[PDB]
Symmetry: D6
Subunit: 165 residues, 12 copies
């Protein structure tokens, strides 16, 4: 039971990296060029896009993916130099658990569970409130939900292993 | 008879991956930039494109291709770690069969067998119903039919092997 | 005489792959962005481009190139697994001959021997018949003729080897 | 205590290179195409963009990254040719410390800690003072702060090792 | 004297390939997007560009480069299979000489020694004669002259070796 | 003293190649698309850009970089074939010195030490003299100065070694 | 009682002529230039304006005003030539009554009592139904109501005189 | 019976002049500015408008009105100079009859009984046949019918008087 | 004292008519062509202009001027026909007083004392509230104040004469 | 026979004045606003219109009409002052004859008998020869022919009277 | 001396009325349509035109002309009714003098002696200060100076007559 | 001889007034709307039109026509009041002579004898010198020459009468 868990954790991690790396870079490519607002004021599109999308999803996901792989690299570099290992194993597991729980909570607090098609903006130089329109909201919602689903499994597995000890 | 079946399954899988990877990424590249509707309302093109094409074909095909290769990776990782194999062989065959039948059914239910050149849209902010025009419908229909044809062979072969036992 | 034939067949095949792969992808890149019709009707350009160019040359050539290399892969996979070979050799030669004759005939029936600079279109939403103008017709004609020339040699060589037995 | 310091220095350096190389090249790609000023004078956008952004962040960061890796290459080339090493070790550590402190100070003096959304320009051919609007200011501020944070750790670690001797 | 000739021939060939491959692909990239004619007739730009530039320089140079490397590949494939060599050596030298002289003559007859900045066009649908304007004529002239210079050396060297026997 | 000189020459050469190859290709990418003149005459932008920038900096630098590496390749090919070496060593050093001094002088005579923001043009079809505006002049000036600085070191080092004999 | 009736009839007639002649010609002047529809189809504005406004109000009112003054001119011309009068007086009164009742009924049946601000159009070449927007609807409604009010008095007065005999 | 005929002829003539002079000049004012064709060819609108409307209705009607009043002026000038009258009376009646019958026939042969909303044009520089759209067709049809009705009465009356003698 | 009052009343009336008739028709001529709103929605300008200016000032003033001259015309027509006068004099004075007081009150209730330069609009098809800008507000305010001043004198004079009896 | 000639001369003169004054001023009103040339050069339309139409028809006709009425005014002023008359009568007849023959000849030499729809222009700043398109050519041809016809009668009549003496 | 003064006063008054009435109405006709500012903000042109030209010159001059003719009308109406005259003569002279001095002073205080070609504007919605450009400044300056010159003579003459008593 | 001179002077004066009043007002109507310069600078057209045409021809001619009729009005007003005449006759003749000579000289000094089609402008905000293009230069030259011719006759006649005394 504990034998297969490692294999499936490795497979889930590789699957997530592959899915993010191969297709996700090209849904968001036209994010700002097809964002449009009903207005004649110069500079309103920039401010309203910036307020609607402060950090793009793909940047957050790349950062999370890179940051969740550091303890393994540290352990590998230590063992390579060696040529209390168990204490290092315990500590890196603890750190990975903490980092992944923090990242999941931050994702939930930053983005929620949906991307709406309309956005209402009231930032200078826009006069009062204006209405703007988003590109590809359904695909982005699907990607959001898929990533949340993938991220839950890793949390579950790491808690499993934490509790087996 | 059962000897050649494995060889042809491997060849079909590699053929499908190559066809999707090399040429398919560039028919759909201009999907939204050349989508146009007869209207003067800002934001209507975004809503009507989103309603006509919720998930693009190439994303669905990439996802399917990646998801149908996971049991092999699991078996390989297990055997590498080993350094009841037959039970694992049986189970992974069952899982692959199920996944490929599910994906074929989902393709049929999502897209059908044709891409029409006209689309009729009645989503806000569009006033009543408007007419929009699609890019490269014939090429996309050809690609659809080809992919359905390729996908049928794999189902047939996997049922063959399932029934030989 | 039969010794050099294999060497020249291999050289012709590699030459064709290289020519198609390195330069051909960039003559057709602007095929639709510089296609223009004399009209004020929205959606006429899409319909007329689709009727004038149902499948682009480069897609057909990539498909043909990929499909004419499958018997070799099958023979290689069989021999690798082995670790009646002559019957397989005979059959794969027959199949390659048939496939290449079919593809040459299909090319002739699909495209002919020239690409004209003007096209006359009468498809909805275009009113009656309209005149449209093509990009780079001379270069595309040169490419067509070159590909036909290259494809003839392979047919000749394969018939040669078929008849030597 | 001094054992782990080398491992963490190597990990921080690799992390910085990866973060800069993979995602940073694509936030700044549209820096000038979406920069716009409220004016009708030809040539004002060029002058005001040039005055607001004399050297782009990504160029400065690439230059710094490349320049902070030269002492290691020199030491490696020397040792490879060998086939007073300790004096070379001391000197290269001193040089790396100096270079990294200089680069951090220069970053602080060139850019500060924020990127504002508005810029006021009074350069010819602009008449008097004009107002211009920046793209993606929040993301660029986040990147600035992250890079400052990363750069502080290296300074601390190098001072640590300098003082251990 | 005959010893160094082979070394310099190899160096010239590699130099030509590198120069063509690394920089030449990006001077001609905007060839048609910045070609403009003084006219209001739709379709005149396409016809006049096609008449002014029937085959682009870079296509001709790529084709020539690929075609001048075939005899070496043939000799290599023969010798690999072997595991009258001198007759093959003689014949391939003769063929290479002929091909390179033909290609130099064709270059001279196709393009000449300069690219002018203005072009006068009288092709349908253009009314009578119109004036059009070319992009980057000086850089293209420099490239033309450089390529002619490079190509002369190879002819000289091959005639040298032909005459030494 | 002569031991370290070779190491530093190699490091400077590699540094120059890396700096030119990684970042320099993307400052000049938009050189002509953001070049604009105050005029209504068709074709004036092409002529004035061509007169202001006959050969772009990056082309000159790539050519120089490629041409300054040929003597090493010649020496390597000779020594590989060998399987009066000192005379070849002397001669290639002389040739490298000459080539690098020529290239530095040519750079100084072609470009000078600055790129101004305004340019005054009087070429047909422009009527009398017109004013045009350049993109990113400060960054291009910085690059110019940096390249001159890098190029001076190599001249100094090669004269050093020439005079040690 | 019958003495003042003639005086007030004359005053009402003159008042109506003056009101129509002096101000009414300039509310409707921009009727079609400021009529606009939400569409991109050429020719839709013409068809929809024609269907919304078949005959403009001012034309109908001018025609009515001219036609209601003919019996007086006939009586005057007869009496001038004279240089059974009572029978002519009776008959012309009858005819005037009939004409004015007919014109009031026709006005009611042609225009109603209001001019709406929106109009829904489904005439070729408009695709399906489109929405169009009218200029100055409130002023036109006020004019309509005023004219109906003025026209009622004349009917009442003429019936009065008819019944006094 | 013959007494009233003169009075009614005079009233009809004055009515026609007033109707044409006061309102008719302003329906046709925008005849060419709101005429539009579905095309991108310069000069097609001019040719198609000229072919659809060779002589405008209002010019024909003004000419007819002026030409039908000449015999009265001649008779008046003769009688004024006098300070065989019956022969002149007979002859001028004959001439007026002939002129009015000719003008009615010409109207019928020039314009018919309706103005359609669409017109199909095939005149140079228009390519093949194009579709154009007319302004205010219903109002112009109403005016046509009204003028025909008015013109019939005069013919009838003049034949009446001709036959009474 | 009562002698001059009639003279000054006549002079004030003529002055008002002249001022309104000669210059007032040309300040308001461009009222709608230079009215503009900050929006991209078709039809918003029409609705917002109609809501901001339901009846234009000049129409109201023309109507008032015409309506305040009817009692004099009635008295004149009566006296002309005569060829209880004092009762008619009394009654017409009463009626004129009432009409002028009503018109002054209505002016105050319709327009107030100023025309602002900005207007805030929230009528369909405008999304939420939009800002629009008026033409020539200061001149229109001056005209408003002048007309109120002129209208007060007539009220005062008529009350004077009413009270003298 | 000589009695009626004066009456008909007076009628023809008045007819010509009326025809020119009432309708001719409004065919030529849009002469330059709807004149268009196929070109992108600023200033070409002005030069080509000026070369095609140096003096407009209506100016020439107004000038001729005014100049042919001066002898009558002179005779009238003389006779009014009187309060050798026959010598003045003779001389003014001679002068009128001469002036009208001169004007007819000048008309023929200036304009000819037709107005073509196309005009070919080669005046600076137009590059080489360009094609331009005229407005309302058929109506202008009809007017030309009518005016020539009218002008012939006056010449005939004046020669008649000249020869009767 | 006092005899001619009245004649010249009458001639000057009539001259001023004629000059203002015949030509002055058509220099200012395009005052706002050719007023333009260097800005992209909607509504800035309206505010800046209103601030630069609060009341147009021609309105002020028409008002002054009308107001300076009232005392004569009053005297005429009094004398007509008569069918202490000297006291009325004295008083009306006094009033005319006062009115004309007031109007001249007001002209000087409102407009000055010149109309500049540039205007600097800082009114909302304009951002900071913007530059705008006036139409026909020299002609307007000439008109200003001429009107001041004309107005001085009347003041002088009226003071003359005032002092003769 | 002196008898006819007065008659011809009166006829010439009336002819000049008629020619200026009837046709001249409509050649210059589009003077600024069709004036265009080759430039992209806002405000350059206004400055260059103002510098090319400070006072329009028609204004100068109207002013001259009005000013040359004042002595007659003065003499008429004097003689009307009378109900030393010869001294007044002498003086007014002298004044008319002086005024007409002054006006002819001023015309020559202001305008010359031709209107060119091109104008070269160097006024702010135009950068350096720009080229502009005039409307209808030939017609304006014809008008200039005609007016000079007409004006010469009056000078000659007035000198004639001056010298007869």
């Amino acid at each position: 039971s504990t034998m297969i868990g490692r294999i499936l954790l490795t497979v889930v991690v590789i699957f997530r990296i592959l899915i993010v790396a191969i297709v996700g870079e090209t849904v968001y490519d036209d994010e700002q060029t097809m964002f449009v607002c009903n207005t004649l004021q110069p500079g309103c599109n920039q401010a309203c896009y910036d307020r609607a999308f402060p950090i793009s999803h793909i940047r957050y996901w790349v950062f999370q993916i890179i940051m969740v792989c550091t303890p393994s690299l540290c352990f590998i570099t230590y063992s390579v130099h060696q040529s209390g290992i168990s204490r290092f194993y315990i500590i890196q597991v603890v750190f990975r658990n903490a980092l992944e729980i923090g990242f999941l909570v931050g994702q939930y607090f930053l983005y929620g569970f949906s991307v709406p098609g309309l956005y209402e903006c009231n930032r200078y130089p826009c006069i009062k409130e204006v209405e703007c329109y988003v590109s590809r909201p359904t695909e982005k919602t699907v990607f959001l939900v898929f990533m949340f689903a993938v991220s839950g499994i890793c949390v579950v597995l790491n808690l499993a292993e934490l509790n087996h000890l």
